[PDB]
């Protein structure tokens, strides 16, 4: 709303409402690569991003779309998919050589048992070192997909297929 020469417009990423620069400053002071976990309504995405004066650089990247080749047919936008994507991201980053980072959830609310923390647990369980406290993780049953009992009978196959996708994703990086 540029009223005049004395008006101050925010940064572009702040105008778009996509970044918190105070949090970003707090995260950059680590001098560690950020494990950037973002989720849309239909899938979840994880990145390993290091800062540069010219702009952020990404080291590793896993999306929910990559799980479907390993034998996953459930929804990509729930806890099991988020955990599996986190596991794949951690294993891929270990293959690349990068093995440390801090969790960057950005503007996403921090809620125990969230998809973000399921992806975080998947990253942790792959050996990828990242500071955290276990109380924010989802229960292991709902990482397996016990919410399938809610309304859908077809969702009842989520635990065994989650185990199968997990074992195949481990095998790809074994």
């Amino acid at each position: 709303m540029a009223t005049g020469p004395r008006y101050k417009v925010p940064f572009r990423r702040r105008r778009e409402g996509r970044t918190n620069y105070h949090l970003r400053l707090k995260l950059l002071l680590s001098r560690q690569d950020r494990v950037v976990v973002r989720k849309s309504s239909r899938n979840v995405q994880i990145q390993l991003i290091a800062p540069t004066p010219d702009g952020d650089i990404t080291y590793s990247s896993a999306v929910s779309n990559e799980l479907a080749k390993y034998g996953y047919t459930g929804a990509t936008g729930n806890t099991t998919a988020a955990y599996l994507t986190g596991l794949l991201f951690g294993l891929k980053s270990l293959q690349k050589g990068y093995e440390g980072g801090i969790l960057d959830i950005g503007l996403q609310a921090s809620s125990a048992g969230s998809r973000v923390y399921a992806a975080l647990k998947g990253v942790v369980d792959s050996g990828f070192e990242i500071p955290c406290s276990p109380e924010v993780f989802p229960p292991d049953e709902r990482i397996r997909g016990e919410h399938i009992a809610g309304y859908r009978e077809e969702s009842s196959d989520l635990p065994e297929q989650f185990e199968a996708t997990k074992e195949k994703i481990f095998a790809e990086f074994s």
Partner: protein, 165 residues
């Protein structure tokens, strides 16, 4: 997707003085809404009301969903489906102040309690106003996606048959 759905319906009771009357007003409002009400606090001490800063004055409750629809239909029945142009906001919002809480079935007049009036406000939005309410990527909705007064009255007719005089 331009049908002006009902974003929320709000019932507010501005008693102006706390105490037993405030509790009775909040209980009757919660009874007439079927939802917990929340106390409104004054912002400037005034010797006319003899109140201080940050002290309970009234109560209001936000209703969303079929509860809002049912309360809105009852409240419009109390005015007999009538609502004129001056009631409406400049952007599709209305409100009107009824007097007797006795018009809502399920509550009895009390000689001690008296009769407290209240004002009801329903805010008309469009399907997608989450853009200015969600946390991430929050953008102001354009002016072409807001709701006009004539659009609001047309919606009220086609949804409740509440004629506007």
């Amino acid at each position: 997707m331009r049908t002006p759905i009902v974003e929320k319906v709000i019932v507010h009771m501005g008693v102006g003085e706390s105490g037993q009357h405030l509790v009775n007003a909040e209980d009757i409002l919660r009874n007439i809404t079927g939802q917990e009400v929340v106390r409104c606090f004054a912002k400037r001490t005034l010797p006319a009301f003899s109140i201080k800063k940050n002290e309970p004055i009234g109560c209001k409750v936000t209703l969303r969903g079929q509860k809002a629809q049912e309360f809105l239909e009852t409240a419009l029945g109390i005015v007999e489906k009538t609502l004129n142009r001056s009631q409406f906001d400049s952007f599709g919002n209305v409100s009107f102040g009824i007097e007797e809480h006795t018009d809502f079935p399920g509550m009895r007049y009390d000689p001690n309690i008296g009769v407290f009036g209240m004002d009801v406000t329903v805010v008309l939005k469009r399907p997608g106003e989450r853009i200015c309410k969600r946390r991430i990527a929050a953008r102001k909705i354009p002016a072409g996606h807001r709701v006009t007064v004539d659009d609001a009255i047309a919606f009220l007719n086609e949804s409740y048959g509440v004629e506007v005089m």
